From Swiss-Prot, chains A, B:
EF-hand domain location: 13-48, 49-84
UniProt function note: Small zinc- and- and calcium-binding protein that is highly expressed in astrocytes and constitutes one of the most abundant soluble proteins in brain. Weakly binds calcium but binds zinc very tightly-distinct binding sites with different affinities exist for both ions on each monomer. Physiological concentrations of potassium ion antagonize the binding of both divalent cations, especially affecting high-affinity calcium-binding sites. Acts as a neurotrophic factor that promotes astrocytosis and axonal proliferation.
Entry binding sites for Zn(2+): 16, 26, 86, 91
Organism of provenance: Homo sapiens (Human)
Residue numbers bearing the N-acetylserine modification: 2
Single GO BP term: memory
Protein name: Protein S100-B
Blocked amino end (Ser) found at: 2
């Protein structure tokens, strides 16, 4: 596999690692999303410690209003973070 | 860096490797996009050999009509392919 292919596999893997913990196995509830950010995005995002921030993150990502983050919504989140990373080598 | 963070970095890196070849260094023209798919997605996508397919792929991905694929458009493409992969381990 190429580096790009390996990256795509890692996205699927980490999503499912967290989504499969509780409830709907194909979606992230707030606690699953919080843990994914805190454990897996610690170099790119400040740790989430406040319920208000958990709530705002889910509200931002949950485009279909079901209170959870599905795979498409997670990929949109990945796109936003990856876009923000540009500041640290271009702008 | 986590597996997720490494994946994000690989997305940025591959996009720029290809986007920086010609013209606008921040966007993929048709030839750059074709080579990215053929070299870097050979296990997930059939090789592109026909101009009609090149054109359709760009037409599908180019949401702002400038005839190129920017980083956001590229991330949308990655999301489509990563979603399609689910068929090979879920249903
Ligand atoms: Ca879940
Ligand atoms: Ca949702
Ligand atoms: Ca270019
Ligand atoms: Ca475009």
């Amino acid at each position: 596999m190429s580096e790009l292919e390996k990256a795509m596999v890692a996205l699927i893997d980490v999503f499912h690692q967290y989504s499969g913990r509780e409830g709907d196995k194909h979606k992230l509830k707030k606690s699953e999303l919080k843990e994914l950010i805190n454990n897996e995005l610690s170099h790119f995002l400040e740790e989430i410690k406040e319920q208000e921030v958990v709530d705002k993150v889910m509200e931002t990502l949950d485009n279909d209003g079901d209170g959870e983050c599905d795979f498409q919504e997670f990929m949109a989140f990945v796109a936003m973070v990856t876009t923000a990373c540009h500041e640290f080598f271009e702008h």
